[PDB]
Design a protein around this nucleic acid. Structure first.
Lengths: 93, 100, 107, 82, 96, 108, 81, 100
DNA sequence: ATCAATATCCACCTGCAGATTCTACCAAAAGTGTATTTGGAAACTGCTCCATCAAAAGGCATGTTCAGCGGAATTCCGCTGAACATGCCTTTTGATGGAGCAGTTTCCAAATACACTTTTGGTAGAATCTGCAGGTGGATATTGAT
DNA sequence: ATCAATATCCACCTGCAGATTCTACCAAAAGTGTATTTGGAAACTGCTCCATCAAAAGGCATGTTCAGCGGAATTCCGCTGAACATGCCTTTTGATGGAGCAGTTTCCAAATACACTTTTGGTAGAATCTGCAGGTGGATATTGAT
């Protein structure tokens, strides 16, 4: 059983362009893209944590990782959605 | 009076627009595969290849060469030429850190 | 029983991302807010690239996004271009771009 | 017995690559130089790929082997599983 | 209560005297060597880490450190690093 | 006392117990074989010996007995392999190798 | 009567150039260099300060700088780590 | 008296010889420190700097510039000059990927 | 070729900043012995997909001819960078309060760990469906000879 | 500029393979619900070492003169682009045997998990020690002028 972000890429796809599809090769690239950024952010968080003698990765290191890794405007927006999602997940069980 | 001939350089520009517009691999598929198997073989014998592994190497290889020619073109133009030469390729690789 | 993705208001799988973080051995521990935040960011980024690839498809009068569309969208956006500065999108081609001195005539 | 396959990288294929690369005029010596440059690129990627293969005690080079090798060299490839 | 600050300095020095018995080394040079050791350690360890993950393994053994070295060091340096490493693991295993 | 260090066993100057400790705590994997830190320390020691061996010569060559940063830089950049391995490393206070593009030399 | 980037003077930029094997320098180089130096420092400092704030400090440490350099692929030996 | 004068390039050559021999920093410290602090002020206010942190940054910057001056020289020479220019630094940075 | 002006060397000298040897106090390692647990190789094997031999055919490589114009060599001159001596303002060095960097103590929100229960993202397989490549024609440039 | 040879542009069109559409199986996730453990935030504090100010130190800003480099102009040869004839080898559609990757159970050698004992590398403060960077002198190589 090999997992992939396809259904999630597809969901988000329908939110931004309701009538557009995606070829499988393009979905393959999208899946590589998600795994790539994922590893990059986590790796960044990993080191960040170690550099600070911390054994726990929290929403806070993920945030710095994002500021360290992403270009100007993209960081600004990812940090917002990130904060936003955490606060909302917090306000509920 | 009879024959029609494009001037040197017109077909080359026509071609750049053509190739910059598409995405298919430009090296013949099988010959590329034999090259892979030869280099691989002279490293380790009795090796098999997933076809996609050969395709992944061709995709990487062509993107690397296309990006290298861009750099080379800039090196030629830096010398006030429009013809790329070996030394342009060498300069670009030396600065890229592949022999710096 | 609500998924952690819905509690966070996300499409991306919070449970899966939290799981991949643990297995990837990045630290002894992983806080619960970490995967929520990381899935938000991952989701936000795929939304940006699909937003842009979709326009490129539209521009080429196509309905289905293909690799070339992803490539156009990435290389035409300064930030995505930088984030993927050392990434190769298979079957993506390059952006049409002929150096001036190479064009004919004289004006 | 594969021998001189570097010649399968024909003058017309090298020329097309130069075109996508935005190149208008090519010196006669460019073709042998390019082949030399490609052989080295390939030797390096295949060496690392084949090393991931053997570490896995496999006889078949997989796309992941090639993808992991490419990533080592800072030439990350999207589209084949990584 | 001034907490420790480990470093490879004493071992670097020990090694220095075996190679150049009558040679010394300055503080700044020692700091660089220390940086050198941590750097290779991270690079090698890091690569071994990935090797394991790729092959779905939970354990980093001398096997992984070896392939890591082959992938990391240049030819001849890797050749000797592999033998030195194999030598130490051998000698170690063969001892009560 | 009958308590011999793993380093003495592997016959190494570098600290096996420590390399082991550092691997476990670096979050590189769930588990760590017993030979990995031995192998790894052996490799760290060897490279350390290779550089000190060359930096040392570089010092003798300058009629100096104490190795300084300059010496490590001269050692590393004059050696094809060490140079590649440290291709993206800056040695503080090391300078560059004396080198002048021929075309820039005076027309003799 | 004092702009900082101009504190990085011509004589100094010329010495650097020399260490790099440069024999003749165009006048426009000095200003061009500062601009490059400035982009360099902003990229590195930004990352260092990000490591400073993460650790909740008000002092940039050599380590914050070393880590930033390592990220930019400009690894530096001699100042820790 | 016998107004001794060295020809253009002789002292320069003499300087390359000297600086390629030594390792001292070539930018004055205080001015460099001011620049670092000023640029940092834009990222966070009231910051302090370990002495060692500024020295690390200066060592890194000079090594970076000296190397960029190396590739730059190569670009000038490629264009048959002995005089480096902005087009030269710009080409080098572009190929280094800090540029097209 | 011939000095004359400078820069560069080399052998020697010595003061001190930084390397060293010294000794102890000790928490944190690192080694050791016992009990418990488990990753992952060995072994059997189902099954994907790799290598390969086959055959037909036209897309595309090869090799040639011909001459347009790009590269490169040479001449030449306006100008801009190199060298230099003039004059001094900024950097550098060494001494002194205080802000934070850390070391300790504490304790509470938060993160395992474990047991069930429940929702679901794969997928093997079938059947249905749709965007679009790719063939066609003919209308709109673009080129290049005159 | 008028004109003929060609390539580009492009909306229309339809076979097909690649994509969307179930239906079902479902076991590995992902979630819910106690019990148990603990990391690191938070408040307090001591000692660095960092920012600041003064004075002694030495590098840089500045204007002049002209050497020589860079680039404009001119020139010619030959190499590289276009066009064309010829024909092979890649590519394409298919099938086949079997290598070998990967699923599954089995079980031990190696690893984790405390608990106890011993060694030791790092730190602090004191005293002792030394490699060598500049400083001098005098010889001599280098460079630039006649």
């Amino acid at each position: 059983r090999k997992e992939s972000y396809a259904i999630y890429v597809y969901k988000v796809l329908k939110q931004v362009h309701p009538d557009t599809g995606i070829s499988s090769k393009a979905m393959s690239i999208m899946n590589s893209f998600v795994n790539d950024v994922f590893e990059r952010i986590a790796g960044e968080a990993s080191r960040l944590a170690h550099y600070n003698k911390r054994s726990t990765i929290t929403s806070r290191e993920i945030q710095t990782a994002v500021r360290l890794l992403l270009p100007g405007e993209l960081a600004k927006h990812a940090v917002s959605e990130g904060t936003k999602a955490v606060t909302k997940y917090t306000s509920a069980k | 009076k009879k024959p029609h001939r494009y001037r040197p350089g017109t077909v080359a520009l026509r071609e750049i627009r053509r190739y910059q517009k598409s995405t298919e691999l430009l090296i013949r598929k099988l010959p590329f595969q034999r090259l892979v198997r030869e280099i691989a073989q002279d490293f380790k014998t009795d090796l098999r290849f997933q076809s996609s592994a050969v395709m992944a190497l061709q995709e990487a290889s062509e993107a690397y060469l296309v990006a290298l020619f861009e750099d080379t073109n800039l090196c030629a133009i830096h010398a006030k030429r429009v013809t790329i030469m070996p030394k342009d390729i060498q300069l670009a690789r030396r600065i890229r850190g592949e022999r710096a | 029983a609500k998924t952690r993705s819905s509690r966070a208001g996300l499409q991306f799988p919070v449970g899966r991302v939290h799981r991949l973080l643990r297995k990837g051995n990045y630290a002894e521990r992983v806080g619960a807010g970490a995967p929520v935040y990381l899935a938000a960011v991952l989701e936000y980024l795929t939304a940006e690239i699909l937003e842009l690839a979709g326009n490129a498809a539209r521009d080429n009068k196509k309905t289905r996004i293909i690799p070339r569309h992803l490539q156009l969208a990435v290389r035409n956006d300064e930030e995505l271009n930088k984030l993927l500065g050392r990434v190769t999108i298979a079957q993506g081609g390059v952006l049409p771009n002929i150096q001036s001195v190479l064009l004919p005539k004289k004006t | 017995v594969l021998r001189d396959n570097i010649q399968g990288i024909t003058k017309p294929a090298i020329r097309r690559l130069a075109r996508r690369g935005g190149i208008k005029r090519i010196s006669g010596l460019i073709y042998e130089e390019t082949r030399g440059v490609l052989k080295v690129f390939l030797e390096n990627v295949i060496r690392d790929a084949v090393t991931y293969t053997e570490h896995a005690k496999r006889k078949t080079v997989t796309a992941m082997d090639v993808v992991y090798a490419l990533k080592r060299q800072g030439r990350t490839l999207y589209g084949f599983g990584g």
